[PDB]
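Thread: zinc ion complex, take 2
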Amino acid sequence: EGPQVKIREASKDNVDFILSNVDLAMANSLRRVMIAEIPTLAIDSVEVETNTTVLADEFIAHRLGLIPLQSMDIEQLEYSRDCFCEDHCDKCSVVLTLQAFGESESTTNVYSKDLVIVSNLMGRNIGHPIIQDKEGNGVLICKLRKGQELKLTCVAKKGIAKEHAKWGPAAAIEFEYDPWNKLKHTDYWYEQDSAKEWPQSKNCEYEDPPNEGDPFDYKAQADTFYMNVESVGSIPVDQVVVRGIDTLQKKVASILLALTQM
Amino acid sequence: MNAPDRFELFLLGEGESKLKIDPDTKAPNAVVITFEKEDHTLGNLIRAELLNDRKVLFAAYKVEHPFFARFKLRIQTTEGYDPKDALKNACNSIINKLGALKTNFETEWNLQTL
Amino acid sequence: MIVPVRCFSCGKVVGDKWESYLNLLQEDELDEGTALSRLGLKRYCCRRMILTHVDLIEKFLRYNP
Amino acid sequence: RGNLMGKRVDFSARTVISGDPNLELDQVGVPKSIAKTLTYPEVVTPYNIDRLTQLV
Amino acid sequence: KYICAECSSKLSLSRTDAVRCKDCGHRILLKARTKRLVQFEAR
Amino acid sequence: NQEDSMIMNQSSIDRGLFRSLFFRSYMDQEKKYGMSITETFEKPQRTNT
Amino acid sequence: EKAIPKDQRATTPYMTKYERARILGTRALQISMNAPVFVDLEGETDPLRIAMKELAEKKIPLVIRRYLPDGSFEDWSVEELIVDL
Ligand SMILES: [Zn+2]
Ligand SMILES: [Zn+2]
Ligand SMILES: [Zn+2]
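Output below.
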């Protein structure tokens, strides 16, 4: 039985669900691991061979780093710092090449789709740029004028959002509980009427409104946490939550292993 | 010019133990466990699990400074109960709860067509 | 210069929809709020990230280099 | 008044200050770079001979 | 080894030589980027 | 954030918040000190220097 | 003639904070220069701590010359001085 999940709604990159029979600390830790501890693939190193755009090499490198990359098979990929390799071997990194240049009177727009994978993925669907716009162009990177040649290589390593936000698989993770002020955790700031000033939350409909007749429940504890997870696009929300749970469990197991060893 | 090593926050340094357990003289049967390269995420959950156990008496987690990825957990239990055993039981319970939550989420996702 | 790749507050990717935002503003002659809502920006962080951006890259490209 | 009452100092650093609730009243944070640049001439003694050798 | 601000054409001039563009009268004479490998990180 | 201080999000900082580019220009001339004598822009080779 | 005898001293027998700081500094400087230590050290290496312990045990052989404005000086041994701090 334990804790159960009630998915109010699901989407391609957005899932809203409810967690029950779970402690507040556990939910907060789950949110923290999901926002920070989930491994993800993103561009880490940028090597410039011929750049003449109005922008700067550091600027374009930073923009490229934030570009989402497919990370469904991230678990198969290994950290570069772990595997014994000279530098960015195919077993721990994904190599892409960006090439572009302008022409007579048409500005050249660089998008995510322009990136071309050059390393051998060994049949792994990892490192592919994420495209979600209706037009399908992708994330705009820069603009090149006539005579402006852009030519660079990008190496993406496995990493977590803690080292850099570019690896963040989830954009916004909404977490709420106790819509009606049942636990007295928050003292609403009011000038005329607390109820009127503060609009009722959307989740309020899923819990019985409080009755003034009954007294305050001092034995009540936080429960029925409404959590909405949105994915940038690198990993689907379901896989995002699954990987967050896996990372938290792995960290707890590592703590247990350290305790046993010591 | 001297910003901290970002990777060092979650990576153990050379000659550094993940956990450092020492006795506490403030109260009987009290221990201090220093967790290195860890944040509130694990400390708060472990402490909350420990407090849910009747035998455990005191369980408090403290972060000395945001600069250093490290915290200290003070655990005091009843006589004849080793704090390490209580921590192991709490970790096992956390793992079981996480596995149950994962299974429930997977089942719910499979049930829903979307 | 260019629209930020990800929202500063949350990190949602907003660079894809900048061209769509401009097309909606021009082609459909829609208001700022309606266009942003259609693009799928609920949190006001992304709303102000897109609305407040200025396309200085085009101005820089106006020069011959 | 320019070189006798007030004169420039060798061993000293200057920089911005930021609040820190997690520091003791008599304890002041110091940048690592400033600590490296600033030095103290500790004399070699048998008590801390090993420590000074390790520092060297 | 050098390029023109306006013409943007290579010159590859040597020492003890005029620093004026051969194609035009402009003599800004900008220099192209170094051939040495350059790497940057998003951090 | 006491004493009007502020707390800034590290994730936002590394994600493109308030990043800046600083450009500094150095100018050099071969100003002549005496006719027929002028400076030369060449890499020193440690000889006669 | 300016020197005052051991008795008939009008200065305060109690140790002064400036005097305590000066004695601690001098003792620490001497110890750092490989000077003899009159108190057994129980795993202590900091000269300041050793000086503080010696002052607590009144093992410091230094002296204090209380100088009057006129010029006369009074001698005071560290052992007889009283440390209120
Ligand atoms: Zn490798
Ligand atoms: Zn946003
Ligand atoms: Zn020219």
